[PDB]
Each structure stands twice: as structure tokens, then as C-alpha cells.
Amino acid sequence: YQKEEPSYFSHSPSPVEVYTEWDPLEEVIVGIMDDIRVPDWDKSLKAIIPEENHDFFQTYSGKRFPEELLIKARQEVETLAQILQAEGIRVKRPNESNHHQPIMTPHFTTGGTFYSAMPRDCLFAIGKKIIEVPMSWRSRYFETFAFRDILNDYFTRGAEWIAAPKPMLSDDVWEKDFDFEQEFPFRSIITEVEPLFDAADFMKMGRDIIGQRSHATNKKGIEWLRRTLGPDYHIHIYEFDEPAPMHIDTTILPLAPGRVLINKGWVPQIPDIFKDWEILNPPASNLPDDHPLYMSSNWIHTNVLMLDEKTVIVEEDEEALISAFRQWGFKTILCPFKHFQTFGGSFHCATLDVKRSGSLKSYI
Amino acid sequence: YQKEEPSYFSHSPSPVEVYTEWDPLEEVIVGIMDDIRVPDWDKSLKAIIPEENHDFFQTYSGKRFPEELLIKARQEVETLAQILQAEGIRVKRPNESNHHQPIMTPHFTTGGTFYSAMPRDCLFAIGKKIIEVPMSWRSRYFETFAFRDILNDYFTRGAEWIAAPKPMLSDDVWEKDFDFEQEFPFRSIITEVEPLFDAADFMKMGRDIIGQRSHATNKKGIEWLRRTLGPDYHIHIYEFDEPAPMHIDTTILPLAPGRVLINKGWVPQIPDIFKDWEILNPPASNLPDDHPLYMSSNWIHTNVLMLDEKTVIVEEDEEALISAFRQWGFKTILCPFKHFQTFGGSFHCATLDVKRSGSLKSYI
């Protein structure tokens, strides 16, 4: 009689383990800026991108961004990674890849991929799970491939590495009766044909998670996250006043137990899970009006990263915000990032916290 | 304060619920035989396709199978579907798709997909989970798309519908220095660069699952399925003497509690979980030597399907085995299927049991 084969992996604790946005950070993924590609102009971009930039994205669809802005964005994210290394944190970076090659799938084609700069959009990590999300942007279909050396490694060492079903993203994804000139109120550009969501529509609070619907995240996608995470976690969905919402990390940022940064202008009614929390309202950005912001509001400066309950990284020229964080009792670590922010994210979007020290608790 | 949005789904019970190969079958997916495509000749096919047929697969690489054979095969899977409906079983079928359109991904291209006839290969279902597995074949990259109306339906009614990370399938997926005439000892054509497996390398026995490594199922893939299923289930891996193995369902087939069909020639040492089981050795096949078999051995007739512990569907011309099943105490439902068997599978490969009545138990 034949005996079964022993296990192929050794017994090892998961290098992925994180429950909140604020526990002491131990390991983080940090995006890169390599030879990126302007995505092909379509309805996903048309619904989300600031009206003032439409002429640019239509002109450069499927081609490159200005080299001078990219060189500055590159130096800024390398500076950020060097600062995280200096704070004792393990840092992983995705690989370079060829963003400029034709892509053909059963229901769409693109001129390539997009970028590897925003790991927070394409990966969701809580507990020991790291999830490749089903993204609605066709140019982000293969975005996780650049992170695959990191993911396979986490997997071999005990991480639960799983994925939503890769979407079809046929033209059936888009609303046929959409008015692009009706900036308000929010009507989603994507339908309920399949589960879709970007990880950056959710924020982690232990046994509780806050999220929103957006042009990137539908009800099926939220329900898929609910089911996959299981009954250990509760996802609470709220609705805010931002026109054309995409990610949530410029609206609600938990910074410590009982302390949440909230975009006051877009949140006139605060989620009830914060009734006993201290509410901090961030001042407006000091960026010139001249400064290009291809893929975000003028509130991208609130997209901060917590190294622990009392330490935050914030863009170096945001003096009003920096000053506020200090009065609130936070240590500030300053980093230049305005040119990275042109490309639609700041420190939070550019990172994924995969390990923070602490256990799974309730804070509401 | 603002209250969170209610759930979007209902408390409906999962329509996927299955634990064994033999519990009374209530719902099943049955494949279709549409205008299918010959896969592009590559090293997976060279390792896996029988040597007699290499001339054909090289010469018709990326083009079609003979219509005469295809028409008969399409007839036979429709006869099967109707036979299952007449038994009172709910039958689901995938949509038609375009198998002949070029596919381009960052690390490979193909001239299309393959076929939608073998749902047992591309989907794995146990408990309430239905899983899109990471297949090693580039031509099978989008195989689950034809099934997505079924999968979306099951999901909205409560099934746990998840996926392995879609593989990169770069040329690093194959051993660069592989020699093909030394079929023994077994050496995998696919490497350990990413998790890969076909669902047909695993059989369900409640809390216990039996699987094997194959040219389509690697060590990382087995670990991935172990972790994803969790500690409710145990996967036992064994090794058999089939040359160039791809699936397990012509080698080991549990038919009822304590009764297992074992292909005696390939299994000189029986897996120890069968020490207390009755072991049924099937007789040899009845097909004439001249009958075309593209992608299988002449043991394809053991790939049977159980509708309950005492009812088995078997190919109608397999006189010896039909008689064996009756001697063993099984009701036999006969169906013509030889023409379908030419394309690599019989009843078990052609189907996926998504619901059988019963609870999770142990049979070992």
C-alpha cells in the first residue's frame, strides 16, 4: 500500500498580516515609475479624469507622459522608499515591465498596460490574505504581473494569496445611458454585470472595514469582498458627496484608534461607526492651481501613510496640513511627492501595508 | 450621522453545495462542443499528447478538427444532457464563444482558445466554493469566460466564487532542458514558477480529497488548493505509473462509500486511504483499434459519472465494463459517447457536479 506525499512547503508564519491602517508598520510594498503608458481613452477614463485634462489624454492616448514630469515623479518615489528603509521597515518593489505592447482578450484590446506605481489599487491585504482585485480598467488587467515575484514569495511562506475572477470587461460593463455632462450626482459608469472593485475604495479598521461604491467598485464587488473575507470582518458601505468618486483614501483616513481624518466638505454626515471617534478635518492644499493633477481632486494631499499610531508621512510643501498634524499631536515625516501626485496618488496609494504588528481587534 | 447601506444580496442558500463524487446529483454543468480550435503546438502538448498524434497536432496547429468527428461528438454530449434532465437533474451549459481569435498577453500569444467541453478541467467545486483554477495551457487561459453567466448566477445566490491568480505562462513555465523520450521516471514539463493545476487531477471524498501531480498540476498548485480549501478538507497526493499523466479520472474513481474503481495496470500500490475499501478493477476497453483518440489512452471508458451511490452512466458500447458494473451491483445508464471521447474526455470530464444532497462527512 502506498503512503501519501508529504507537504511541499515548510511550516512558516505568514509574512502578510495586517488589520488596521495605523499599527506599527513592518513591511510595505512601494510602487515604481518605469516607462509607463497613457491608457487608451475610453469611458472608464472619461468618467473619472478631471475635465481640464481631457484634451491631454485624448491627444496622448496609448502614448507616453511628458518625460520631465516622469523623471521628477520617479525621483520622488525613490526618495519615499529610501525614507521607509531608514525607518526600519522592510520594503518590496515591483519589477519593471513592458507597458507598451498590444494586448488582445476575448472582449477587448489595449495598447498595453498602465503603471506599477499604485499597489494600493490592485492589491487588498487584511489578515493573512492578499487579494488580486478584479479591476474595471482594461489597461490595468495585468497590473499584478509586476508584483508577482513578491506575491509568489509571500505565498511560499504562508500568505493566503488569492484572486477575484478575472473580469471580461466587455462593452457591457459600461452604462449606455450615462450623461458625462452631469457632474452631479454620482451615477456609476460601471454596471453590475460582474464583480468589480479597486482595493483603494476600502480602509481597514480591524474587524471593521469602511468602503464606498464608486466608478471602480460595484455592489457585486463589495459583496465578493464580504464573502471572501468571511464573518470575521464587517464591511460598512457609506456614501459621500465627492463628484465622480474613485478611491476612498482622499475622503476617510483612520489614523489611530478613535481618530479619523475626514474631508469635511465631502462628508456632511459622518459614518455612524465614528460616533465616539475624534474627527479631524484637514485644511486645503497649498499646491498652485497651475500644478497638473491628471487623476484626482485637489485633496490628494490628504492621502497620507501612517507608520504607527502617532507618525504620518505627508507631502513636504503642504505647510497648512503639516502644521495641523503637529497640533493634533502627530510626528510628521516630510517627503516631496507633488510630482508623483500628478499621476493620481500620494503615499497611501503608492504603498501597500502587508505587515503591521498587532492582533485582530474591534475599535468601534 | 449616516447609516451604512444595506446588504445588496439576499440570504439565499448557495446553489453550489457538493462534497463527494457519489451523493445524489441535483445540479450539474455539462460542456458544449462548439466550433473549437486545435491548440497551438507547444511543449505542454508535446509532453501530453500521445506520440501517434503528434503529426496531426503539428500539422493542424491552430486550425480545426475534422467536422465529421466534431458533429458526432456534439450530438453525443447533447444526448447526455437530455438524459440527465430526464433524470430530474438541473443542467447548466456554457455559452458559445469565438475560439478562433488571437490572444495577446504580456508573456505569450495564441491564435485563440480551445473548447468548452470539459468543465471538470477548468473549475473545481467542493462545499460552497467554485474555483477558477490556474491552468497551465495558454489556449485555455479564458476557458471560464463561456461559463460566466452560470458563475455569476451562482454567486448572486450565495456561492463562494473565487479564482487562483491568473498565471503569466511565460516561457519560464516550461523546463528549458527537457528530453521527451525518457517517459520514466516522471519529470514535469511545467516548472514551479507559479501555482498551476487542472481540477481533473483531484477527486472529492468529503473531508478527504485525492490528487496527483501531473504535467498540468505542480507542487505550488496543490499547496494553493490546500490553503484555499482550509482545514476542513485534507488533500492526499499519490503517485501512479501512468506514462505522461494529465488527469486522475481514468486512474482512480471513488464510486460509493468504501468502493473505488482503480485501473489495476497503472496502480501497482493502492493508496492507503483505500485499505478498507472494496477495489473494483475495470476490464479493458471495447473500442476498435482504429477509433480515433486524440488526447487520451484507451482507458477513457473508465471516466464515468455517478448520479447516486448505485447509478452510473457508462458508454453504451463498452460491453465488458457495462457487465462488470452490473455484477458489482450498479444500475447502468447507457449513453453513446465514443465520438466525444475522441476529444479527450468521457462523462466525468464532460461535467461538473455543483450540487449533490448530503453533508460533509468522513469516509476514511
Which grid cell sits at A148? 508577482
**Residues in chain B within 8 Å Cβ distance of A101:** 104, 106
Method used to determine the 3D structure: X-ray
Look at residue B302 and give its three-state secondary structure. Answer: helix
CA A341 to chain centre: 13
Q: Are B135 and B122 in contact (CB under 8 A)?
A: yes
For chain A, counts of helices (H) and of strands (E): 8, 17
Contact A163 B161 (CB under 8 A): no
**Residues in chain A within 8 Å Cβ distance of B5:** 213, 237-239
Residue of B151, B189, B160 lying closest to B172 (CA atoms): B189
B321 has which bridge partners?
Answer: none
- Specify the length of chain B in residues: 364
The CA-atom distances, in angstroms, between B292 and each of B57, B70, B296 are 13, 12, 10
User: What's phi and psi for B52, nearest 5 deg?
Assistant: -50, -35
**Catalytic residue chosen out of the listed positions A23, A40, A99, A247:** A247
Rounded to whole angstroms, the Cα distance separating A282 from A302 reads 7
Where do we find the cell 507631502?
A: A315
CA A192 to chain centre: 21
Please compute Rg for chain A using Cα positions. Answer: 20
What residue type is assigned to position B309 of the chain? E
CA end-to-end span of chain A, whole Å? 56
Cα torsion through A110, A112, A114, A117, rounded to 10: 150
Rounded to whole angstroms, the Cα distance separating A345 from A118 reads 7
A169 phi-psi bin (left φ>0, alpha ψ -120 to 50, beta other):
left
CA B100 to chain centre: 23
The CA-atom distances, in angstroms, between A199 and each of A176, A180, A306, B242 are 25, 25, 18, 45
Domains of chain A: 1-364 (3.75.10.10)
β pairing state of B259-262 and B252-256: antiparallel
Which grid cell sits at B308? 447516486
DSSP assignment of B175-212: -SS--SS---S---SB-SSS----GGGEEEETTEEEE-
Neighbouring CB atoms inside 10 A of A79's CB total 15
Nearest-by-Cβ selection for B104 from A104, A224, A238: A104
Min CA distance, B286 vs chain A (Å)? 30
Contact B227 A160 (CB under 8 A): yes
β pairing state of B208-211 and B234-237: parallel
Is B290 marked active-site?
no
- Specify the length of chain A in residues: 364
Please compute Rg for chain B using Cα positions. Answer: 20
Min CA distance, B3 vs chain A (Å)? 6
A203 has which bridge partners?
Answer: A210
**Residues in chain A within 8 Å Cβ distance of B9:** 223
Give chain B's largest Cα–Cα span.
77
Q: Are B287 and B317 in contact (CB under 8 A)?
A: yes
**Residues in chain B within 8 Å Cβ distance of A201:** none
Is B335 marked active-site?
no
Q: In a 10 Å sphere around its CB, with 0-12 CB exposed, 13-18 middle and 19+ buried, how is residue B72 labelled?
A: middle
Which grid cell sits at A258? 478613535
Which grid cell sits at A42? 475610453
The CA-atom distances, in angstroms, between A87 and each of A307, A333, A353 are 9, 10, 14
B333 has which bridge partners?
Answer: B313
Nearest-by-Cβ selection for A162 from B106, B220, B228: B228
Where do we find the cell 504588528?
A: A357
Where do we find the cell 484572486?
A: A163
Cβ neighbours of residue B313 closer than 8 Å, sequence gap 6 or more: B80, B83, B304, B305, B306, B307, B332, B333, B334, B335, B347
Residue of A348, A279, A317 lying closest to A22 (CA atoms): A348
Rounded to whole angstroms, the Cα distance separating B172 from B192 reads 9
Q: Are B271 and A1 in contact (CB under 8 A)?
A: yes
Which grid cell sits at B194? 507559479
Residue of B97, B98, B155 lying closest to B123 (CA atoms): B155
Using omega within 30 degrees of 0 as the cis cutoff, is the peptide bond preceding B243 cis?
A: no
Residue of A251, A234, A276 lying closest to A364 (CA atoms): A276
Using omega within 30 degrees of 0 as the cis cutoff, is the peptide bond preceding B185 cis?
A: yes
For chain B, counts of helices (H) and of strands (E): 8, 17
Rounded to whole angstroms, the Cα distance separating A185 from B241 reads 65
Rounded to whole angstroms, the Cα distance separating A165 from B228 reads 14
Neighbouring CB atoms inside 10 A of B121's CB total 26
Min CA distance, B83 vs chain A (Å)? 32
Nearest-by-Cβ selection for B5 from A9, A132, A239: A239
Is A198 marked active-site?
yes
Contact B237 A5 (CB under 8 A): yes
Residue of A360, A356, A362 lying closest to A28 (CA atoms): A356
Which grid cell sits at A103? 494586448
What residue type is assigned to position A212 of the chain? Q
Which grid cell sits at B135? 491552468
CA B148 to chain centre: 18
Min CA distance, B9 vs chain A (Å)? 7
Rounded to whole angstroms, the Cα distance separating A127 from A104 reads 35
What are the residue ranges of helices labelled H in chain A? Answer: 43-48, 54-59, 67-86, 119-122, 148-156, 219-229, 319-327, 338-341
Where do we find the cell 502538448?
A: B45
Cβ neighbours of residue B168 closer than 8 Å, sequence gap 6 or more: A145, A148, B105, B106, B107, B193, B194
Min CA distance, A269 vs chain B (Å)? 5
What residue type is assigned to position A183 of the chain? E
Residue of A65, A5, A78 lying closest to A35 (CA atoms): A65
CA B131 to chain centre: 13
Look at residue A219 and give its three-state secondary structure. Answer: helix
A208 has which bridge partners?
Answer: A205, A234
Q: Are B26 and B355 in contact (CB under 8 A)?
A: yes
Contact A271 B222 (CB under 8 A): no
What are the residue ranges of helices labelled H in chain B? Answer: 43-48, 54-59, 67-86, 119-122, 148-156, 219-229, 319-327, 338-341
Q: In a 10 Å sphere around its CB, with 0-12 CB exposed, 13-18 middle and 19+ buried, how is residue A177 labelled?
A: exposed
Q: What strand order describes the sheet that includes B234-237?
A: B202-205, B208-211, B234-237
Residue of B248, B303, B300 lying closest to B271 (CA atoms): B248
Using omega within 30 degrees of 0 as the cis cutoff, is the peptide bond preceding A271 cis?
A: no
Rounded to whole angstroms, the Cα distance separating B214 from B197 reads 8
Rounded to whole angstroms, the Cα distance separating B182 from B243 reads 10
β pairing state of B259-262 and B278-280: parallel
Rounded to whole angstroms, the Cα distance separating B67 from A125 reads 49
Contact A155 B238 (CB under 8 A): no
Nearest-by-Cβ selection for B4 from A142, A156, A238: A238
The number of C-alpha atoms within 13 Å of A193 and in the hemisphere containing its C-beta is 18
Using CA of residue B332, residue B337, residue B338, residue B340, what is the dihedral sign? negative
Q: Are A99 and A35 in contact (CB under 8 A)?
A: yes
Rounded to whole angstroms, the Cα distance separating A61 from A42 reads 9
